[PDB]
């Protein structure tokens, strides 16, 4: 029969032929290898495009829209360096891992100004332009939600959005520049080299451009989420700490690195555990951005001191301080304006009493993290002071936060990020459903029985008051002897019967069954089961610095160090985030929203290396297949009269090929007798039910003589349409010139 798509363990899908049908599954013969066979579930085998070399800008133009034809379409585009593709209004963006010529040029930006989605090739610029036009025209704030795994290109596509807006709609407005020049500053304190991304955002962000009633930019605002605290002290084999550390160590003036007792990064514990990373140049680029948003030389110094302060704090070794450390402690207590005694005292002794080596270490790091984290808070807030405002009418908000992705070991940090993406995914489901309903109503397509099933029960499991996991966790932190194991049992007992919760030992995967019931749980997230190791959940849920250490630093010699802290010692990390996340949804839910799905093509940061299975998984995890299923319920195939005309005029009599696209298609419907059930002649496009586009395509490709015949039978009607078109147009022009009179 016809080649079909069937599963393939590394390509995601492969071409093969169905050689045998079973009740549960189909026997496939891979294309190349006659004699080879394998089984696939019936719902895992998909029809393919006849033309395996074509590519379309909108996947709705495919004859068969499904995960396999989608994967293959973006694959062909990506091979030709076209990294952007639409699924209706959604932008899919595949990281190219190199700089593609022309695509982001100032000229190319101009070519997108004012244009509707579809009138230009798919592009992040088109999404940016649409947010601005919907704002200005609809008088409604706008959000652009950029998601994907680490390394997928969220941060880059976020910059492209800000660049496009600044150059298109902010020519004389410097506020735009301060907003663009902000991210270089944030990235210094919040980004870091990981094994997944050399410039990984270690925090989530929402960037709001604020406007007055005349679409003029009046200010900006930046929200930041979930800074990665643990990276402040220890980092993985092949990773680094936050950029700013290495940037200041490799860019500081001879003077400064002398006043701050700075050496090469190898001299600090916090940096100990760099070919493609221009720390030196990036330092320069940072200082530029600081002057550009209005940091004085004094602030620049204040930040640096603390960064340096934190560095030396990490050198203090332990008991009490060795001698290697008494020079460290001296530097540290000087940069943080502390009494070298109280500090050493505070690092070595606790009130409840002496401290072992371990306990002195935790207390040193705990203080380090708290100082750095507040520093970062101060920085982000400083940025918001570069474009404040007491009032505004609208905003355009760009969300840049890490999606769901796979980790060998899922701890609390993944638990927070996956919690977040459950709520974003819900929002996304709700929004795609509304757009589809709106379209079906505007074009008279009827109803769609298909509905994404809600994940509210999953969200509730995590966040509900008193019984949600986050509150159960908070109780634990407040108990006399908090324990990760007691926490985990509480969750299991409370939700024994929960659809979304499971015990690790029920897993099909042996490595999970190895985990005792009170050491983890499996949550059935939107994207799939995630097994959480709850060890350390209790400690990680706590942002609070011990009273002794906090006092030490609160009452400090330096005013800037004291101002960082103008704020049982327990501050819940989970619940703080919940509140932030809920504030963020309040904002998104008040906007019209667009979606950019960023896809990381492989794990090696290389170009032109499409890993099909890795990419298929991201499409699934990011809800895209959910969208394809919704579309299958109605009219998943959508083509403009223009697109159809170019595709099929060649099969029709020259007389027909001479009509305009709209009238051409209108004639085809009439000559073919197309059933109003399967085919919808819309306002500007033809809408086809599943299979019906492929069927229409066969009709156009059938016997040319018979086709000419059908057209001929409708000739009188066609000629009459043509008369009426021009006749009524004439009456139109006349009614219009009579209206011009009527108004004077």
């Amino acid at each position: 029969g016809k080649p079909v798509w069937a599963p393939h363990p590394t390509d995601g899908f492969q071409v093969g032929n169905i050689v045998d049908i079973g009740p549960d599954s189909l026997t496939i013969e891979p294309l190349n290898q006659k004699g080879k066979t394998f089984l696939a579930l019936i719902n895992q085998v998909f029809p393919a495009e006849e033309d395996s070399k074509k590519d379309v800008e909108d996947n709705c133009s495919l004859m068969y829209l499904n995960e396999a034809t989608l994967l293959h379409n973006i694959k062909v585009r990506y091979s030709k360096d076209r990294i952007y593709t639409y699924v209706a209004n959604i932008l899919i963006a595949v990281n190219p891992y190199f700089d593609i010529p022309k695509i982001y040029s100032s000229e190319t930006i101009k070519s997108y100004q004012g244009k509707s989605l579809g009138t230009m090739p798919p592009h992040v610029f088109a999404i940016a332009d649409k947010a601005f036009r919907d704002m200005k025209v609809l008088k409604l704030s706008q959000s652009i939600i950029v998601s994907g795994e680490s390394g997928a290109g969220k941060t880059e596509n976020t910059k492209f959005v800000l660049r496009y807006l600044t150059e298109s709609y902010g020519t004389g407005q410097d506020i735009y520049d301060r907003i663009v020049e902000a991210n270089p500053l944030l990235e210094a304190f919040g980004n870091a080299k990981t094994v997944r991304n050399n410039n990984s955002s270690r925090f989530g962000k929402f960037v709001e451009i604020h406007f007055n009633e005349k679409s003029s930019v009046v200010g900006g605002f930046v929200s930041h989420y979930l800074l990665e605290k643990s990276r402040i002290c220890v980092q993985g084999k092949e990773e680094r700490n936050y950029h700013i550390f290495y940037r200041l160590c490799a860019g500081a003036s001879e003077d400064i690195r002398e006043r701050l007792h700075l050496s090469s990064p190898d001299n600090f514990r916090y940096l100990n555990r760099d070919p493609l990373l221009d720390d030196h140049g990036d330092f320069i680029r940072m200082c530029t951005a600081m002057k550009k948003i209005g940091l004085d030389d004094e602030e620049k110094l204040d930040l640096f001191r603390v960064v340096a302060g934190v560095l030396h704090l990490g050198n203090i070794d332990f008991c009490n301080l060795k001698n290697k450390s008494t020079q460290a402690l001296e530097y540290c207590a000087e940069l943080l304006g502390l009494d070298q005694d109280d500090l050493r005292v505070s690092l070595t002794t606790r009130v409840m009493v002496p401290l072992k080596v371990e306990q002195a270490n935790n207390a040193r790091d705990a203080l380090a993290k708290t100082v750095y984290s507040h520093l970062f808070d101060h920085v982000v807030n400083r940025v918001n002071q570069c474009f404040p405002f007491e009032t505004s009418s609208y905003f355009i908000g760009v969300l840049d936060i890490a999606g769901f992705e796979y980790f060998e070991h899922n701890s609390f940090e993944q638990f927070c990020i996956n919690y977040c993406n459950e709520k974003l995914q819900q929002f996304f489901n709700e929004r795609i459903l509304k757009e589809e309903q709106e379209l079906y109503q505007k074009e008279g397509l009827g109803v769609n029985e298909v509905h994404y099933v809600d994940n509210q029960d999953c969200i509730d499991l995590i966040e509900a008051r008193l019984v949600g996991i986050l509150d159960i966790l908070d109780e634990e932190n407040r108990l006399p002897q908090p324990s990760d194991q007691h926490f985990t049992s509480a969750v299991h007992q409370k939700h024994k019967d929960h659809f979304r919760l499971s015990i690790p030992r029920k897993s099909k995967l042996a490595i999970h069954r190895n985990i005792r019931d009170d050491e983890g749980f499996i949550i059935r997230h939107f994207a799939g089961a995630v097994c959480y190791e709850t060890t350390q959940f209790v400690e990680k849920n706590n942002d609070a610095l011990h009273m002794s250490l906090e006092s030490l630093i609160c009452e400090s010699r330096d005013k800037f160090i004291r101002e960082l802290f103008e704020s049982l010692s327990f501050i819940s990390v989970g619940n703080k985030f919940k509140t932030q996340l809920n504030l963020l949804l309040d904002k998104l839910r008040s906007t019209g929203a667009s979606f950019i799905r960023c896809i990381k093509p492989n794990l090696k940061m290389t170009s032109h290396h499409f890993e099909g299975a890795q990419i298929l998984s991201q499409l699934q995890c990011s809800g895209m297949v959910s969208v394809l299923d919704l579309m299958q319920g109605g009219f998943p195939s959508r083509a403009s009269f223009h697109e159809l005309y170019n595709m099929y005029k060649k099969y029709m009599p020259d007389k027909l090929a001479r009509l305009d696209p709209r009238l051409f298609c209108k004639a085809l419907f009439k000559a073919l007798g197309l059933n109003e059930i399967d085919y919808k002649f819309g306002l500007t496009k033809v809408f086809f039910r599943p299979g019906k586009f492929a069927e229409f395509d066969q009709i156009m490709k059938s016997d040319p003589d018979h086709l000419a015949e059908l057209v001929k039978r409708v000739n009188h009607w066609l000629i009459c349409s043509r008369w009426k078109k021009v006749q009524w147009c004439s009456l139109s022009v006349i009614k219009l010139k009579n209206k011009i009179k009527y108004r004077a």
């Binding site: 223009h642 001479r658 009456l731 022009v733 006349i734 010139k737 009579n738 011009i740 009527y742």
Partner: protein, 148 residues
């Protein structure tokens, strides 16, 4: 509109694609003027602007078919309806002799961007030519205009 029948609205929808050449369902003043000029009119930009401001509910400066429908609407004395058809005909019958000739149809079609051959223009004439004299008169023009 609500003063127009289903049939009437259908015909204007088709007429509208003549302004909306790109087929996105919206026109600007640019496309309003171009078509009007093609049919022997000549509004000033100021005149278009004023007219389009009535129905352009948003500020976009572009309109769509139902906004168009209302932009054509106005108060009309009985005489006005027929006066208008009578005058559309005279857009075709450029020499006023009461008959639209093939050369004349050809003039209007090509002016409107319609592509067709000379033979096809003759065909158009022939099909409207009820009495068989080889040209199109008023009654025949009206008949064709109002026929499904």
């Amino acid at each position: 509109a609500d003063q127009l029948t289903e049939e009437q609205i259908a015909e204007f929808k088709e007429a509208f694609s003549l302004f909306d050449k790109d087929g996105d369902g919206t026109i600007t003043t640019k496309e309003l003027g171009t078509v009007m000029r093609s049919l022997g009119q000549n509004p000033t930009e100021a005149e278009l602007q004023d007219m389009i401001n009535e129905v352009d509910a948003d500020g976009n400066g572009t309109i769509d078919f139902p906004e168009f429908l209302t932009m054509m609407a106005r108060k009309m004395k009985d005489t006005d309806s027929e006066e208008e058809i009578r005058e559309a005909f005279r857009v075709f019958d450029k020499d006023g002799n009461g008959f639209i000739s093939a050369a004349e149809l050809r003039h209007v079609m090509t002016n409107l961007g319609e592509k067709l051959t000379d033979e096809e223009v003759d065909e158009m004439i022939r099909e409207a030519d009820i009495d068989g004299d080889g040209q199109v008169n008023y009654e025949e023009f009206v008949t064709m205009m109002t026929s499904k």
